[PDB]
Amino acid sequence: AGELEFVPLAANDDETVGQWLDLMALAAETGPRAAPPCNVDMVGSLRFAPPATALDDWVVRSGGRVVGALRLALPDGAPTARVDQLLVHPGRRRRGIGRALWAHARELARKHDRTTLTATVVESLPSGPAQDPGPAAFAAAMGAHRSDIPAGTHQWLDLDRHDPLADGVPAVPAGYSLVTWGTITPDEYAVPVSELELRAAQEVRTSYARQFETMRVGRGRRAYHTGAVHDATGALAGYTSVSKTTGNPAYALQGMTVVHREHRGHALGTLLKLANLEYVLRHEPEVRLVETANAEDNHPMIAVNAALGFEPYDRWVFWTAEAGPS
């Protein structure tokens, strides 16, 4: 744009945070279908990072005003730096600001000893509404490439178009019972939840990370859980969650539904999503629009989401780039 100033984005800097919040609100008017940014969520996203991860947040100023933002997430101990945000004011695009942000990105990755920069790019579905080809044309132009892994299929359910609960919730299969819980997971279900990511000399462990819950709460996010228990063995046969921001009463996020491998074949995923949705709507009556995302190779949950009225809208494509030389 001319002289660009890079200044860190710190949450105590009300003037700079305010501008960043505004940049986002304005870019979201013309970006991908999305819930508007919730300021509580966003500002807490500067203070409360996900587990074992550092943040390195920046804005870029032109003539003293923010005209873009770059956010990196650095997983502790990993050779990667993830671009959680690279955004240029809709009024100042095609002027080299994104390029400059990306160059600053590679420099920050390098300062943090990261070899690789990774990114999620919004693209079109073969089926779906044609999407802005800018991001992908930008990412190619910065020298990134698409990773050879399953992209995400990002889906929407609009309850004003289709009511999945019009025929109530299906019966719980014999041998099972439904349990529900709010934002914090009872101790009882924490380890069982973590073992649902499913010899003997090993080295790595899975565990429930309370910091996820605390990050959420700090971001003003509320959550809703339904679990299925297998009575004879007490294993947690399945579970699922919705996440809801302070802002945007009409929007909600459906998270993963996972069914334990020894409990497939009983329609737990359908029962779980419908019971959990009902549980959301009776606490969040104004919820109308629900989003979710599956890896495009997860056919089973895709088949479940579709039966429920979820419609694939856009594609979440993983890209990667070299950080170096210098």
* Residue 324 counted as an annotated binding residue: no
- 65 vs 95, beta carbon nearer ligand ACO: 95
Q: How far is the CB of 128 from ligand ACO (least distance, A)?
A: 17
CB nearer ligand ACO, residue 135 or residue 192: 135
| Residue 281 assigned ligand-binding role | no
The runs of H, that is alpha helices, within the chain are: 14-27, 39-47, 97-111, 134-141, 187-195, 210-218, 268-281, 299-307
> Which candidate, 74, 68, 38, 45, places its Cα nearest to that of 138?
68
Least Å distance between CB 38 and ligand ACO?
A: 18
Quick check: 268 and 307 in contact, CB under 8 A? no
Q: What is the DSSP letter of 219?
A: T
Distance CA 122, CA 87 (A): 13
Does 114 count as an annotated binding residue? no
By CB under 6 A, what part of segment 290-319 binds ligand ACO? 319
- Under the criterion CB under 6 A, does residue 146 sit at the interface with ligand ACO? no
Looking at residues 150 to 209 of the shown chain, list those that interact with ligand ACO (rule: CB under 6 A): none
Question: Is 96 marked within a binding site?
Answer: yes
Nearer Cβ to ligand ACO (135/227): 135
Assess 143 for contact with ligand ACO (CB under 6 A): no
- Cα–Cα distances in angstroms (integers) from residue 123 to residues 32, 75, 108, 138, 313, in the given order: 9, 25, 26, 12, 10
Among 43, 108, 139, 287, binds ligand ACO (CB under 6 A): 139
Backbone angles phi, psi at 255, to 5 degrees: -95, -165
Query: According to the annotation, is 99 in a ligand binding site?
Result: yes
For 124-192, list the strands marked E by DSSP: 145-146, 152-158, 176-181
What does the DSSP 8-state code read for residue 170?
P
Residue 95 annotated as binding?
Answer: yes
CB of 107 to ligand ACO, least distance (A): 15
Position of minimal CB gap to ligand ACO: 98
Q: Report in angstroms how near the CB of residue 122 gets to ligand ACO at its nearest.
A: 6
Q: What share of the chain is helix, strand, coil (3-state, %, to 5)?
A: 30, 30, 40
Among 66, 73, 119, 280, binds ligand ACO (CB under 6 A): 119
- Tell me: cis bond preceding 133? Omega within 30 of 0 counts: no
- Side chain identity at 106, as an amino acid letter? R
Radius of gyration of the chain (CA): 21
Residue ranges in 37-96 that form contacts with ligand ACO under rule CB under 6 A = 83, 86-88, 93-96
Binding residue ranges:
86, 88, 94-96, 98-99
Residues near ligand ACO (CB under 6 A) are 27, 31, 83, 86-88, 93-99, 119, 121, 134-135, 137-139, 141, 144, 319
